[PDB]
Each structure stands twice: as C-alpha cells, then as structure tokens.
Design a protein around this nucleic acid. Structure first.
Ligand code: MG
Ligand code: MG
Ligand code: MG
Ligand code: MG
Ligand code: MG
Ligand code: MG
Ligand code: MG
Ligand code: MG
Ligand code: MG
Ligand code: MG
Ligand code: MG
Ligand code: MG
Ligand code: MG
Ligand code: MG
Ligand code: MG
Ligand code: MG
Ligand code: MG
Ligand code: MG
Ligand code: MG
Ligand code: MG
Ligand code: MG
Ligand code: MG
Ligand code: MG
Ligand code: MG
Ligand code: MG
Ligand code: MG
Ligand code: MG
Ligand code: MG
Ligand code: MG
Ligand code: MG
Ligand code: MG
Ligand code: MG
Ligand code: MG
Ligand code: MG
Ligand code: MG
Ligand code: MG
Ligand code: MG
Ligand code: ZN
Lengths: 232, 54, 60, 155
RNA sequence: CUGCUGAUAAGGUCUUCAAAA
RNA sequence: AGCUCGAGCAAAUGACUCUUAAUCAUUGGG
RNA sequence: GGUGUACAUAUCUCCCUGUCACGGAGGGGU
RNA sequence: GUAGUACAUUCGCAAGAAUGAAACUCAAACGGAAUUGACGGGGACCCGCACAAGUGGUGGAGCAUGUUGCUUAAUUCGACGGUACACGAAAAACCUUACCUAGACUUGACAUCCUUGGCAAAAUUAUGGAAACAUAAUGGAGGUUAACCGAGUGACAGGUGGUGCAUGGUUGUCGUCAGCUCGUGUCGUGAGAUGUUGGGUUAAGUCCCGCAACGAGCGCAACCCUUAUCGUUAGUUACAUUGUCUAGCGAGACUGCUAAUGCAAAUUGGAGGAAGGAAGGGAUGACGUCAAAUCAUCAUGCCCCUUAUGUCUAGGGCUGCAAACGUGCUACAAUGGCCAAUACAAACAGUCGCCAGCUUGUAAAAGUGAGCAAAUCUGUAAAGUUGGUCUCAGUUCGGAUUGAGGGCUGCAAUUCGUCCUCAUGAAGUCGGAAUCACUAGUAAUCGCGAAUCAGCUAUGUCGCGGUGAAUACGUUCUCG
RNA sequence: GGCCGUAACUAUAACGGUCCUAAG
C-alpha cells in the first residue's frame, strides 16, 4: 500500500530542517516560505550539471544566508568567478535588493552516497535513452562501491516508451524503512522522456545514528574536506 | 494542523502536523556595561528568538 | 482558466470584500492555510521536504 | 474464537445499607450517566418503602429480588426452521443481573406518578410474588418446562 | 442432523530483448 | 410516417462504458 | 381496475442481496 | 463434431442387435498425466464488536446537509457496493466560479526571445456609463534604466478543453492482517518443490525444537511521541493554605526474583512495586489485487481551440422540486419544562484582534473605554446542588412554518446571510420488514476551543475536559 | 374446456397468470 515519506517521518527527530528562520507575522511567513522554494527550485532545475546535493536557507529579520552543497562546484564558480555573479544577481532579484545575501558554496565530500544526485543521474540517463537495466545496474554498483549500506531504487512510468506502465525495483542490501534510528536519505526525481514522465525514487541507507540529537552535524560531507567559499 | 492526505476524496484519511514554540524566561537584576559589552558578542542562533524588555 | 485567476487575485479589486486568499505556490483557491499562505496539498509537500521550520509530525 | 474469558470489575458495597445489590440496581437505573439522580431515585423509593410497609427496606428489597430471581434460561438455537429452545442453569451473578434488569424495565413502564413512586410500588408488589417481573419469570419458567425435552442437546 | 438456496450479455491488455558490460 | 395499429417498433443523435450490447432521454420523419 | 373472475395477478415504495430473481413490510387503482 | 446417425444387408414377433459412411464444419477436442492458485452448500486448526450478553441509536415526525431523478438559459465538474453520498468544498449573496444571458478585447489579463527608447505604472477626481472601457485632469515611487514603463515584432502566450484505459506524484481497500520473496544447495525430463510445511508459544513467518536444507531482504517487534510514580535543575507572569505547577535531564519495569512444567522458547500463580508480563493511546501500513480514485492541487505524452474552447465586467445560477436514499440535529417529556441562587475544568486563541468595567436598550447590540503581543489581560462553563412552580394533558412538551418590528457584517442581505423581540403554534405520545456503533474513563451524556471566515440554521470537521455505565457463559450458527 | 400476456426483422408462442369441472 501507501507508505509515509521517509524524509517526512524522520524530520524533527533525527534530521534538521532545510530552512531555519522565524518570521514576524503570518503575512511574512508565506512570502519567506515561497522565496526559499523559488531559490531551491532554481538551484535544482538549472545549474544541474554541478550535482547540487542540497541547499539550506537561513534567514533573520533582514539577512539571507544560503548554503549550497555541490559535488562539482567548479560549474557554479565558472571561469574566474563569472557565473557566480550571475547566480548572485538571480538570487538578489528573487528575494530583494533591500536584503543582504550571504551565499556560500560547499564542496560535498563522498558525493556518491547522496540520494539527490543519484536520482538526478538516474533521470539524466533515462532521458538520454540509456537502457534502464544497464542504467540501474551501474548506478547500484557504483553506489555500493562507494561504501554504503543497502540502496533501493524504484523507477516507474511508461517504461521504455511502452503503452502500459510498469515499475522496476532493485534493492541491494538491508534497507530498514520502519526503523527511525537508521540514516535513510530519500530523493525523488522526474525524467522528462519523449514518451512522458518517469518517476525515480532512491532510498539510500547510510548506517545507524547511535548519537541522540537533532543532527546539528554534517551528513556525509565530512569524509574529505568540506571547505569552499564565495561568502563574506 | 490537520491536513487531508488524498488529492481528491477520502476526507477520512487525514494526517496531522505540529509546531511547538518552546519558551524560557530569564531576568537579570543589574548588568552594567561590564556585562552588556560581553553580552554583545553572544551570537544567538537563528532559531532562538529574543524578546528583551529592558 | 488558472493564470488569469491567479493574476486577478494578485491585482487589488475595487471592493474590499472582493479579495480572497489563493495559495502562493500553486493556484488552489479552497482550503488555504492563512498561517502559511499555502494550500493543504502543498503544505504536505513542504513539510515532508523540511521547508517549513518546526513543522514535525504529531504523535499527541 | 476468542478463547479468552473476560475479567470482572468490582461490584463495590453500598455505602448506606452495605448491600452490593443496591449499587447494582443504581447502575441499572442509571441513565445519561447521572449517579446523583439514580441514587436520589433509589433512596427516595426506599424511604417510601419505609413509609408504606413499615419494615426494613433492605429486607423488603432482598425479598423482592430473591422472589423475582429466575432459575432457568432458554437459549435460542436454530437448525432448519424457527428455533428450538434449550433450558440451562444460570450462574448466580447472571441470575441477580437478570432479576435487577427485569425489575428496572418493568418499573419504568408502570402507569403511576414520578419514577420514585413507580419503582417503589414495583418493588413492594414484587415483594409479594405479584407483579410484572413475576409474570416475566413465570413465562420463561413455563416455556422452559414445556421445552424440557431438548435440554439434553445444547451444542 | 438433515427447510429452501436459481441465475450473472460480447471482444479484449500486460512483457519489451540480451546482444553485454 | 420505413413497419404493425398519435402509440409501439425501426432509424439517428447524445448520455452510459476500455469499446459495445442492453438501458436512458431527445428527436426528425405523414 | 391493466388481465382472469371484493379476490388473485399485475403496478409503485422500502427492506434483502455484489446485482437480479425469489422472499418480507407498506400503498394505491372499478 | 457430424455419428454410433443415414442408406443397403443379416438376425429378431417387437423393442432392437450386428455392420457402418459421406456431404458440411473447427483448429483444435466434455484429449491423458502432473504443477501453482482460486473456489467447494469438503474436512482440521486459529482470529476480528463477527455471532452471543448488554447499552444507545438508525428505518417512523420536523429540520440541516449531500446524492439519485426531473425541470431550467445554466442548474459547472468530479466521487457511485464494501473502498461514493456533512465526499473534493478548512466557509457558493458580489469575488470564489470552472455554468447561462448580455456588454466589450485580440502577440492579448500573464511570460520569454529578439531591434529599440525610457522624461511610468498605480491610485483618485470629472463626463458618458449595469460595470467592463473610453475621452481630461494631479502626471508622479524611483533611477536614467535597475525592477519595471514602453513602441516594433513573429516565434507564441492562454485552455478548470478530451483521454486517470498513455503517465509521474498522492491516496482508498484487503490490513497493522501476517504475509511476500531472493542467493546457494538438493529433488523432478518440466511447470515446479524444499527452505515458508511438522510439534510447542505468541498479536505476529515472534521465538524455540524437528527437519535436504543453509542463510538473507521487506514486513512483525524495539528504537520515536504522550499518559501513569519519583529524583534533580528553575521559581516569574506560576505557587505564596508553600510545594502544586510548568519544562529540560534522569531514575524506574528488565519475565528482574520466586513456585509449578518444559530440552528450550516459553505459559500460569505469588512477592515487592505507581505501573507485570505488547502498562494505556498515537506515529509507523511489505510484495501486490481492484486497468480502484484524482489530467479540476501540481507536473506531463498525445489530440483539439487559436479575433476563441483564450480575456474583462454586470446580472442570474451552483440554494429549483411531484419524488427516493445516506449522514446528522431537535423532539415525542416528570431521570422532565420554566424561574432564582450557586460550586467545580482542560486545551486552545487573540493587536483590522480578544474585549474587562460603566451607560443605554425587553434583547440581539450601540457608545465610552481601560488591560493584553500574553503562565500577567480577555474569551460568563454546562450538566451537577438547593429552593419555587407545573401534575401526565398533544400540555407551561415539541419547535417547524408563518406575519411584524429591530441588530451586525458587507458597495449590496429580493433570488440567497445570520441573530434578537413580539405573535402563530405542522408533525410527533417511542417508530414496520430490516440494520449501526461500542470491551473503561469505553459507550451514553454536558459544555469549551480552533482551522478556513468581513458575515454565515456548520446541527459539519478537528481537538479539550465534567459526570460516567452494562456485558463477554461460549464458537452451534452469521460476515470477513 | 375457456380467457389473457409472452422470444433482439416480422410471424407464432417453448413459457407465465387465472376461472370452472368428476376429469378437459
Ligand atoms: Mg494551470
Ligand atoms: Mg471571502
Ligand atoms: Mg424456504
Ligand atoms: Mg435465464
Ligand atoms: Mg469515458
Ligand atoms: Mg464397429
Ligand atoms: Mg461429445
Ligand atoms: Mg471466500
Ligand atoms: Mg458458508
Ligand atoms: Mg447482538
Ligand atoms: Mg441523538
Ligand atoms: Mg428519519
Ligand atoms: Mg473531467
Ligand atoms: Mg453533481
Ligand atoms: Mg471517473
Ligand atoms: Mg459567482
Ligand atoms: Mg519621470
Ligand atoms: Mg536611457
Ligand atoms: Mg487507475
Ligand atoms: Mg506461507
Ligand atoms: Mg519437509
Ligand atoms: Mg523450519
Ligand atoms: Mg512497528
Ligand atoms: Mg477506470
Ligand atoms: Mg473510491
Ligand atoms: Mg490540461
Ligand atoms: Mg459575475
Ligand atoms: Mg453544492
Ligand atoms: Mg423540577
Ligand atoms: Mg493574577
Ligand atoms: Mg460579563
Ligand atoms: Mg434541582
Ligand atoms: Mg398529535
Ligand atoms: Mg416549550
Ligand atoms: Mg434575506
Ligand atoms: Mg403524552
Ligand atoms: Mg478490542
Ligand atoms: Zn498549493
């Protein structure tokens, strides 16, 4: 049957919030809730070739701070910091010139075990007419070789352009979805194929969190150094 | 906040969400500049909200 | 007809009671949360994505 | 297909006459969850019994319930057409419960004035083996005696 | 422990493929 | 009226369903 | 009486059942 | 299949027996054996408010709301057994709105790409106006065009238009039931089987023994929240009858000890304990079935419209009405009606708001007007207790319907808001065949709060507390 | 012995309802 969202079930217990701010009134709460959505959607739908794993937003009465974790931040940086100013102006237009922007790019360590970029690669391969069995097999084998626990990939839709929708699942390793202690990262993406839309959902297991607390700690960004700038 | 799960029908199947505004109080008798200047450099995290009343 | 209705909602009317609250992300008119300015079906998505700070699932 | 026997909650002794049956009949005449109203009804009826019979109300009440209290129960068991009944001996607890239930049901139907006097007169009438609960007990007893033949087969 | 207990319009998806990694 | 004595069939249009049948209404047609 | 002589059949409503029939409750028509 | 039929022949008193085709038609056959499921008015075992034992209802009346049908210019569309019908819709007078009538518009109400300038868009006042829109005004923030304000300009924008049987996402249901599989190995020519069946124990494919199986994954359980006892931290805006209360951390309950029997899991009883053997409740819902629901939250393949199926506005409509069904409220009453005094909550909410007090009014409310951005101020607790009166009647029950006078919101209350007062006083006296919910603070019953909301016969939805029951012998029957 | 209705071109009625008789 239907299952609750893996991220939503674990939020507020073993996962911190992607946007951390306290608005003044109900009128401002909607504007701030929509502007952050616009910024995140921008960073995800465009500038996709940089493998942006996640973007967090942190706002005060008047100051906006953006933390963009990316696997290949060279594409965000551009040639001698060219596209950086373009995305800065895009964000400033999105929120407002009256505020102070503190954009900060962060190179994410051990990218392979991140469901967002795994799903994005899956969707890109699907859209590029790559055969599905080979695509999922190579993604699963590279994810496992990255040194993580089980990964479950569900790819549904008009499969290979067929007129009857199917679904194909590959679980390889233990994926306890009912357990709350487990560190399960879940992402979902849409491959826009010439025959319609394909939905790819990737669950990845990254061990068990044996330290009680609302995170306040990096999650698989720490194995190598996670120090990139563009801030003040 | 109670929200119906389904997109179209089945109002019976509905989930719930909560938001808690945890609140603490702390009153200082006499501070003076010697304490105020040190208090200036605290950098309270964004989630925390101050309601200083003088 | 949805784009015209969204634009008309943003535009101020000539009477005060003419004004209604639509969702800001989507354009749904009914079942809009004035606390968040977002309809129920987008509030669920934002809460499951972690966009709204402090909105955790309730156990009572 | 349950294979579990239900527990039993305490009956509690009455805090006036120290007779559990008083509390039981209070709970039986309970309606809308009004313990105060039920207790008032019972104690007013007992005071009317004092005023009329000139005897101990607890003794009169016991004499009424013991006389109304049945012996046999007829359990419906259908096989092909209609139902052939089965006489079975009842436990003492269910015996008392049925007696109290019949007393209350036939008390809340009599033609008289306030339910105080209604139940009081029903109790005094059942104390002398002439009443409506008496007729009910007589009817079930006669039906069981008629259908004594099928007592051997129960299920 | 043998009461009674009858019927359900037509045609239809759904496996594309292992060549292989 | 196309047929049997405005009626009922026949025909058509839609509703209905994955599509039909059946059904539902409407309907021209002396 | 709509059909055979107030009756039955038939008609309508509600139960029954996945649905229909059967079955059960009620109503009306010379 | 025709068909053991027809003709001819032999036997027989007769029924008939023996012998026995073809024309025509199909791609297979009431073919054989075996396998996996489903089903059985076939057995064995086990579960669930399923049956049983009780409580209170529904079907009968009036009203609210939804639906079917019919009507209409439209009565927008969707949901249709369980799993639709107080459902989408957590607010239809205008807007919403997608429908009808009518008045107006065309790279358009909104957007990008291009050649191009910015020395505007608003808002409001005049006249025409049902308003859209037109002719004139203050010609406007700003920052030289940043955003936006334009001209030219063709790609195009736009669609709540069709297809949920082309899809993504989300959801109902079996079902919180205990199942669904895989790797290696073995058996079989093969589908396939084993493990997963067998014996004990559980809510459990939970665990332990046995065993051609050895292991593993999802599901189960635990980890998460809350209620029940206590310690510590802190004492204002709580308490201030001094240790309640609020919220961080922690202790506590682990079949931990004991007796019985079992190989072992484990089952039952006792002790201490606030709590005992999943302590109560919640979140948590496997593979898949129903081509289940949604193109009308959103996104999207394909088809269709492109001076119209796109856009603005005014009016009407979604509120109709011989009827039928579902879900609820109110009752048919002395366990009560009315009047007076009066005690005891929790949770939540509040600066276009909560509104204390006072004055006015029969009352809805009006005016004045403090307090509160809130453990501080505000949002009257009712059932309950006592007293008075009614005295079993279609009534001092019941309030529908109807006429009149007012209050509030709002440009605007006729279609179509709700409240108060006065007046009228339908049905209904326990509801046929047949059905629903519920196993303790549960059913029943009484109030309070919030969401959407200018306002709303929400009697609906989501929450909180006060009083507070009856029954479970058992699986013969009934559904799953 | 009668009467009435009834099959997806028409036609008919395998079938159904009912009155009477000793039986049609
Ligand atoms: Mg749209
Ligand atoms: Mg409104
Ligand atoms: Mg029978
Ligand atoms: Mg037949
Ligand atoms: Mg269709
Ligand atoms: Mg032969
Ligand atoms: Mg044959
Ligand atoms: Mg079955
Ligand atoms: Mg059976
Ligand atoms: Mg029962
Ligand atoms: Mg009721
Ligand atoms: Mg009714
Ligand atoms: Mg549609
Ligand atoms: Mg409709
Ligand atoms: Mg449909
Ligand atoms: Mg309208
Ligand atoms: Mg200027
Ligand atoms: Mg210039
Ligand atoms: Mg479907
Ligand atoms: Mg099995
Ligand atoms: Mg075996
Ligand atoms: Mg075994
Ligand atoms: Mg669990
Ligand atoms: Mg369908
Ligand atoms: Mg459904
Ligand atoms: Mg569309
Ligand atoms: Mg209009
Ligand atoms: Mg409606
Ligand atoms: Mg009284
Ligand atoms: Mg005070
Ligand atoms: Mg007051
Ligand atoms: Mg009293
Ligand atoms: Mg009457
Ligand atoms: Mg009255
Ligand atoms: Mg009116
Ligand atoms: Mg009466
Ligand atoms: Mg139970
Ligand atoms: Zn929305």
């Amino acid at each position: 049957g239907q299952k609750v969202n893996s991220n939503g079930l674990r939020f507020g217990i073993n996962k911190n919030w992607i946007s951390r701010w306290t608005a003044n009134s109900h009128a401002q709460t909607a504007k701030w809730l929509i502007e952050d959505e616009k910024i995140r959607n921008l960073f995800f739908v465009n500038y996709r070739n940089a493998q942006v794993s996640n973007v967090e937003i942190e706002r005060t009465q008047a100051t906006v701070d953006v933390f963009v974790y990316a696997a290949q931040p060279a594409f965000l940086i551009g040639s001698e910091n060219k596209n950086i100013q373009k995305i800065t102006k895009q964000i400033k237009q999105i929120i407002g010139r009256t505020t102070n922007l503190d954009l900060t790019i962060n190179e994410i360590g051990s990218p392979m075990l991140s469901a967002r970029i795994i799903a994005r690669d899956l969707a890109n391969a699907i859209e590029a007419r790559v055969p599905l069995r080979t695509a999922m097999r190579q993604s699963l084998i590279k994810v496992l070789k990255a040194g993580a626990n089980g990964i479950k990939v569900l790819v549904s839709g008009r499969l290979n352009g067929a007129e009857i929708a199917r679904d194909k699942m590959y679980i390889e390793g233990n994926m306890p979805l009912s357990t709350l202690r487990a560190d399960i990262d879940y992402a979902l993406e849409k491959a826009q194929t010439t025959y319609g839309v394909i939905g790819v959902k990737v669950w990845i297991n990254r061990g068990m969190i044996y330290t009680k607390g609302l995170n306040r700690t990096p999650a698989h960004i720490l194995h190598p150094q996670k120090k990139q700038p563009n801030r003040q | 906040i109670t929200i119906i799960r389904s997109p179209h029908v089945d109002k019976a199947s509905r989930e719930q969400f909560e938001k808690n505004r945890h609140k603490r109080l702390m009153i200082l008798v006499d501070v003076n500049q010697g304490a105020i200047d040190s208090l200036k450099r605290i950098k309270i995290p964004v989630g925390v909200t101050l309601r200083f009343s003088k | 007809a949805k784009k015209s209705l969204k634009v008309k909602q943003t535009r101020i009317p000539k009477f005060a009671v003419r004004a209604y609250t639509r969702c800001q992300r989507c354009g749904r008119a009914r079942a809009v949360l004035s606390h968040f300015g977002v309809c129920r079906l987008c509030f669920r998505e934002l809460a499951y994505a972690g966009a709204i700070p402090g909105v955790k699932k309730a156990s009572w | 297909m349950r294979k579990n026997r239900a527990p039993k909650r305490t009956v509690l002794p009455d805090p006036v006459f120290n007779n559990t049956l008083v509390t039981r009949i209070i709970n039986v005449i309970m309606e809308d969850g009004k313990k105060g109203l039920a207790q008032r009804i019972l104690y007013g009826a007992f005071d009317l019994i004092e005023q009329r019979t000139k005897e101990k109300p607890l003794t009169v009440f016991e004499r009424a319930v013991g006389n109304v209290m049945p012996r046999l129960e007829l359990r419906v068991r259908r096989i092909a057409g209609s139902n052939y009944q089965v006489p079975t001996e009842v436990p003492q607890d269910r015996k008392i419960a049925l007696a109290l239930r019949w007393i209350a049901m036939f008390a809340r139907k009599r033609h008289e004035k306030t339910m105080l006097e209604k139940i009081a007169n029903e109790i005094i009438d059942a104390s002398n083996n002439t009443g409506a609960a008496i007729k009910k007990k007589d009817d079930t007893h006669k039906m069981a005696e008629a259908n004594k033949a099928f007592a051997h087969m129960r299920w």
